[PDB]
Scaffold this motif. Sequence first.
Motif, mmCIF file in Angstrom:
data_model
loop_
_atom_site.group_PDB
_atom_site.id
_atom_site.type_symbol
_atom_site.label_atom_id
_atom_site.label_comp_id
_atom_site.label_asym_id
_atom_site.label_seq_id
_atom_site.Cartn_x
_atom_site.Cartn_y
_atom_site.Cartn_z
ATOM 1 N N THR A 298 2.212 6.268 7.197
ATOM 2 C CA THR A 298 2.769 4.933 7.021
ATOM 3 C C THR A 298 2.042 4.199 5.902
ATOM 4 O O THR A 298 0.819 4.300 5.763
ATOM 5 C CB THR A 298 2.686 4.124 8.318
ATOM 6 N N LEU A 301 4.277 -1.860 7.164
ATOM 7 C CA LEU A 301 4.692 -2.151 8.528
ATOM 8 C C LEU A 301 5.435 -3.475 8.547
ATOM 9 O O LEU A 301 4.918 -4.486 8.061
ATOM 10 C CB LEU A 301 3.490 -2.219 9.477
ATOM 11 N N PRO A 309 -3.521 -1.302 11.534
ATOM 12 C CA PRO A 309 -3.397 -0.310 10.459
ATOM 13 C C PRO A 309 -4.583 0.640 10.416
ATOM 14 O O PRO A 309 -5.736 0.238 10.588
ATOM 15 C CB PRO A 309 -3.322 -1.170 9.192
ATOM 16 N N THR A 415 -2.062 0.187 4.132
ATOM 17 C CA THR A 415 -0.875 -0.391 4.746
ATOM 18 C C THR A 415 -0.599 -1.784 4.194
ATOM 19 O O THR A 415 -1.517 -2.590 4.017
ATOM 20 C CB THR A 415 -1.032 -0.454 6.267
#
Lengths: 549, 549
Positions: A298, A301, A309, A415
Motif C-alpha cells: 500500500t 490510504l 501506516p 503511505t
Amino acid sequence: FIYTMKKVRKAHGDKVILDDVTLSFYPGAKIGVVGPNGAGKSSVLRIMAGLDKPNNGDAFLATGATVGILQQEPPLNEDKTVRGNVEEGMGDIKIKLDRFNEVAELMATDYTDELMEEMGRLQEELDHADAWDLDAQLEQAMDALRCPPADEPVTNLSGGERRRVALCKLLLSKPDLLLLDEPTNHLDAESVQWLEQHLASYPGAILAVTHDRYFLDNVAEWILELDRGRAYPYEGNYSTYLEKKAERLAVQGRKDAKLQKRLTEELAWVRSGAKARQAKSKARLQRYEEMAAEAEKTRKLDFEEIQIPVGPRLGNVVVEVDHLDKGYDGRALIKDLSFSLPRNGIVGVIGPNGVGKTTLFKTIVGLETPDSGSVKVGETVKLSYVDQARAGIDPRKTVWEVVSDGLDYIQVGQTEVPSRAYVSAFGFKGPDQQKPAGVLSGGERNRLNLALTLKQGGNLILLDEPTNDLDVETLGSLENALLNFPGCAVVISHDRWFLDRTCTHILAWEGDDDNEAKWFWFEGNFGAYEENKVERLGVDAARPHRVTH
Amino acid sequence: EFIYTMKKVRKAHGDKVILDDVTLSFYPGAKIGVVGPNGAGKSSVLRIMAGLDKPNNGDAFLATGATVGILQQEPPLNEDKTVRGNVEEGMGDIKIKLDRFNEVAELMATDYTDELMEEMGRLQEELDHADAWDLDAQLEQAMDALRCPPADEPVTNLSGGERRRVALCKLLLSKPDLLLLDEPTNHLDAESVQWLEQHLASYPGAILAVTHDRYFLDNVAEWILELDRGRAYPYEGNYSTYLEKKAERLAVQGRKDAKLQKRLTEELAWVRSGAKARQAKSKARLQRYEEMAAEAEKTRKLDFEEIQIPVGPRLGNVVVEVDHLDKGYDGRALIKDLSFSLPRNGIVGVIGPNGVGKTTLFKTIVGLETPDSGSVKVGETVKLSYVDQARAGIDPRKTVWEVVSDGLDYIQVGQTEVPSRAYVSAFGFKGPDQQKPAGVLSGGERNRLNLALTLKQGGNLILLDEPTNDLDVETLGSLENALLNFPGCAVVISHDRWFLDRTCTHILAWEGDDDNEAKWFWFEGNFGAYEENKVERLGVDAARPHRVT
Ligand SMILES: Nc1ncnc2c1ncn2[C@@H]1O[C@H](COP(=O)(O)OP(=O)(O)O)[C@@H](O)[C@H]1O
Ligand SMILES: Nc1ncnc2c1ncn2[C@@H]1O[C@H](COP(=O)(O)OP(=O)(O)O)[C@@H](O)[C@H]1O
Ligand SMILES: Nc1ncnc2c1ncn2[C@@H]1O[C@H](COP(=O)(O)OP(=O)(O)O)[C@@H](O)[C@H]1O
Ligand SMILES: Nc1ncnc2c1ncn2[C@@H]1O[C@H](COP(=O)(O)OP(=O)(O)O)[C@@H](O)[C@H]1O
Ligand SMILES: [Mg+2]
Ligand SMILES: [Mg+2]
Ligand SMILES: [Mg+2]
Ligand SMILES: [Mg+2]
C-alpha cells in the motif's frame, strides 16, 4: 437567478416537509422533481408559484420574471369558453391581433384612411412580435393535446378536459418559470410525446414533478430528489441520475462492508475461548515478515477508519532492557527489571497512578536515563511518540493546522493520507478541526496528541492511555488498526478489553511494602496475567491495594 | 414498580435541543450502560435523573422513598472531613451507631456501668439483625481496592484523581437505590476497574453507567442505551448482543442498498441501448414460451417484495382471435373492421386518446360486451386475470389486506403459494397502510389495490388498464420485470411510453380520420417502432396527434 431558496423550511405541526432547503435555479433550467408520495414536491411548487409562503427562510422570485403553475385543481375562467380560456393566457399581443382582425373585417363594409393607418401600425407591431406564429402555435397546441371543442362551455367539462385546457393555456402563456405538477396526468401517449418534444425546446425554466421516465430523460437537465423534506440535486438527466445514484450506493456499500467485517471480527473475538486467543497472539508473534511484505504494498490510504501506516522494517533487536534501575530523588520506581521485546509484540503496561509508567516510556525514548542497567534500542527502530504533556507554543494554530502543517496530504513512511480525513478519523469532524489548539479540552488534547503520534512513520508505537475520550466505535477501530500493524507497540491503558484484544505481553507493577519497585513481565494478555498472578501470589495478594512509599 | 420514569422529557439550552421526547421507564435493579458520542446528551440525562436539573417539558420522576446517587465530573466533597470521614458519611446513621458501639466498648475498659451493658446489648441486637458488622470491613476493602489516598489525609490537599477515587468510594458505600455513574473508570487502574466491575455485578440497586468500558457493558449491563443528538435508543442485552444487533441491521441495510443498486444498473443498461436493442428482451418472449413455461413451473423460492405474477395454466397456440370486429354504442362506432391475432407470450400495448374504445375493447375480450359485428374468439386454454377499473367494494370497513388476502396469511394460486402480507406490500401498501379501510382509499390507492387484485387471479391472459397509476419508478420497474418473466399474454392500456417500450411486443393504436373515426392499427413492435412506422405510413402531419371529432 430566476428563483432562489435560502434556508427555506415548511412544516405543519410535527410534519416537516421542507428542511433548510437552499437552492438557486439558473434561468432556463430544466429540473425534474422526484420522490415518494408525501416527500414535499407539490409544496415546493406551491411556494415557487407564490401560493404558499415558507415558515422560515427566503423564497424569492427574480424581479421581472413571470410564473405559471399547473396544479391538481387548475383554475379556469369559468365564464369563458375553451378557446377563450386558452387565449386569455397570452397578453397584449392577442388583443392587438383580435383588433387587427376586427379592423380587417370592418374595412370590407366600411372604409376610412385612418383605419388604414391603424392597420399599418397594428401590422408593424404584430410582425415585430410574430403574432400570427403565436396563433398558429395556439392551434397546434390545442390540436396536439386533444383539447375539447373550442366553443364548449368549460363548466360542463370533466376533470381531464379541464386539465388539458389548463395545460394548453399555461403553455401558451410562456412564463419564465414554469411549474408542472404531474403534467402527464390525463394525457395519452402521443400527447405526452408531443408535450415532451415541445418542452425540450421550451425557453423558460421548468420544475416538473413527474414519474414519467422518458420525460425525465429527454427534458430534465437536473434531477431534484426529495425525501422527508431534504433536497438532493443530481446534475444530468434521468439516466445520468441513475448512474450517479448507483455509484453513491456502491460507495456507501463498500464502506458498510468494511464496517461489517470489523463488526464480525469483534463478535468472533468476544465469542472465542482462551485457547484460540493464545493461538492468535502467538501466531501474530510468528508472522512479522509476511505482514510487513503485505503492508508495504500500500502507498495511499483513504482514511475512512483509523489505520497505522507501516514503518521501516524491523531487525531482531527491538528493545532490550537489562537490570534496569530507575527512580527520582530517594524513591525508586523500577529496580532490576529485565525483558526483551520480540518483533510484532504488543506490550500492555499496567499499574496504579504514579508508579513509573510514563517514566519507563521516557527512558525508552531516552529523554530520561537509567540510574543503573541498560536500555538498548535497535538501530533499525524508529519511534512514534509524543509526550503526554505536549503543549503548543502557538495557541492560534487549529487542530488541522497542527496535524497537517497546512498540507492536504500527509506522508507517513511510504503511505499518503489525506489530512482532512486523517484528522477526522480521530473525532475532529467539521468545524472541530478549526478549533484553536489553545482552547482544547483535556480529551481533545489527548486525541490531538494521539493523531500526532500515529502520523510519525515508525515500527515501535508508544501509546499512553490512547483510549481516552474515544467512543466504543473508535475503540474497535483502533483495535483493528493495531491488529493489522506490522511493527511493535507498547501501550499503557486501563481498558481491559483493549489489552485482551491486542496485547501479546504484559508489563505489570507488583510493588510490595518492602520493595516498591518490582515489576513482572508476562507473555499473554491481561486476563491471563491476572489468572497467573492469582496462581503465583495467591488471591489475597493479587487483589489491588493502595500504594505506599 | 418503576425506580425512574421519563415521559416526553425535553431539555434545551436556548434553541439547541439536547434531549428530545425521551420516554423511558426503568424498573428497580435495572443495569443500563449508556453509550454515544461526545455531546449526545449522556451527562444531561444523568443530571436530570439525579435531580440536579429539571427538563423543560415532560415528566422526570424518581420513585418516592427511593435514593439516588451521582458521580459527576467535579464531585462535591465536604472539606471539613477527612478521607475516612467523608467515606463514612456515606453510610450515615448505621456508622454512627457502630461508632457508638465501639465507644461504649472502649469505655467499659476504664470503668464499668450496667447501663452501658444494657445499651451495648440493645445496640448489638440492631447491629446484628438489621445491619452487618462487615460493613466497616467492606468500607476498608473499597478504599484499598479503589486505591484511595491514605485514610487519614485531609481532603483539601488531594489531587483531582484522589478526590475522584474518594468520591467513588463514598458513593459506593452510600448504596443508593439508583446509582448513576458518569465515566466511572476515570482515574482507575485496570485492576481497580476489575474490582469495580465485580463489585457492581453483585450490586443490588439499579445502575446507569455512562462508560466506553466494553467489559463493563458486557458483564454488568442488561440494556445498552445508545444516545444520538438527543434521541434515546434502548437495546436489550449486554454489549455482545448490542454488537450482534448492530451488525445484523447493518447487513439488512446493505442487502437493501444492493437491491436498489442492481435495479438502477439494470435500468441504466436498458435505457443506454439502442431502439432495436431495447426490444430484445420482449421479442425473445415470442420464440420461448415453452422454455419459459418449463422454468416457471419448476418450484423455486421467490422474492415476494418485488412484483410477482404466479404462473397460470399453460396456453395453447390460439389465444385471442378478433375478426372484422365492429363495435359501438348508440349511433357512434368505436371500432370498425378490426382484425388481429394475439400470439402466445405476446404483450400488447393499447394506445389512443380518452374515450376511443380501449376499455370497451377490454370488455369485448373478456365478454362483458359483445360485438355488434365480427367475432372475438378466446382460446379454450385461456384463463383471464381481470378486475373492472371501477371496482370499489360494498364493505368500506374491510382493509386492503383483508380485501386482497380474504384473511389468509398464505394463498394458493395454482402451483404457487404467496405470502399475502409481502404480496400486498409489493404494491406500495407498507406497514399500517395495509390496515387502511377500503372506504377511505384515494384514487391511486384504489388503483394499486385493483392491480394487486388483478395479478393474484393466476390467469394466463392478463388485462391491465393503466396499471402504472400511482406507482413510483421502483415499483414501475418491478412490474415491468414481472411482466417480462410471465409465461403468457398481457394486454395493457397505458400512457407510460417507457413501460410500453420495455414490455410490449405489439401495439394496438387508434388511428381515426374524419372519414373513418373508428379505425385501428395492429403493429408488431413497441411504442417507438409503432411511431416510426406511423410516420412512414401516414406522413408527419397525419401521424401527429389530433382532436377527436
Ligand atoms: N396545507 C396543508 N396542511 C397540512 N398538511 C399538508 C398541507 N400541504 C401538504 N401537507 C402535507 O405535506 C406532505 C407533503 O405533501 P406534498 O408536497 O403534497 O407531497 P407530494 O410529494 O406527494 O407532492 C404530505 O404528507 C401532506 O399531507
Ligand atoms: N522530573 C521529575 N523529578 C522528580 N520526580 C518526578 C519527575 N517526574 C516524575 N516524578 C515522580 O514520579 C512518579 C511517577 O511518575 P510517572 O511515571 O509520570 O507516573 P505514572 O506512573 O502514572 O506514569 C510521580 O509521583 C512523580 O512525582
Ligand atoms: N449549560 C449548557 N448550555 C448550553 N449547552 C449545553 C449546556 N450543557 C450541555 N450543553 C450541550 O448539550 C450537548 C450534550 O451535552 P452532554 O450531555 O454534556 O454531553 P455528553 O453526552 O458527551 O455527556 C453538548 O453539545 C453541549 O454543547
Ligand atoms: N355502456 C355504455 N353506454 C354508452 N356509452 C358507453 C358505454 N360504455 C362506454 N361508452 C362510451 O364509449 C366511449 C369509450 O369508452 P372507453 O372505452 O371506456 O374509453 P377509454 O378508451 O378512454 O377507456 C366513451 O366515450 C364512453 O362514453
Ligand atoms: Mg403531489
Ligand atoms: Mg502517566
Ligand atoms: Mg459526558
Ligand atoms: Mg379507460
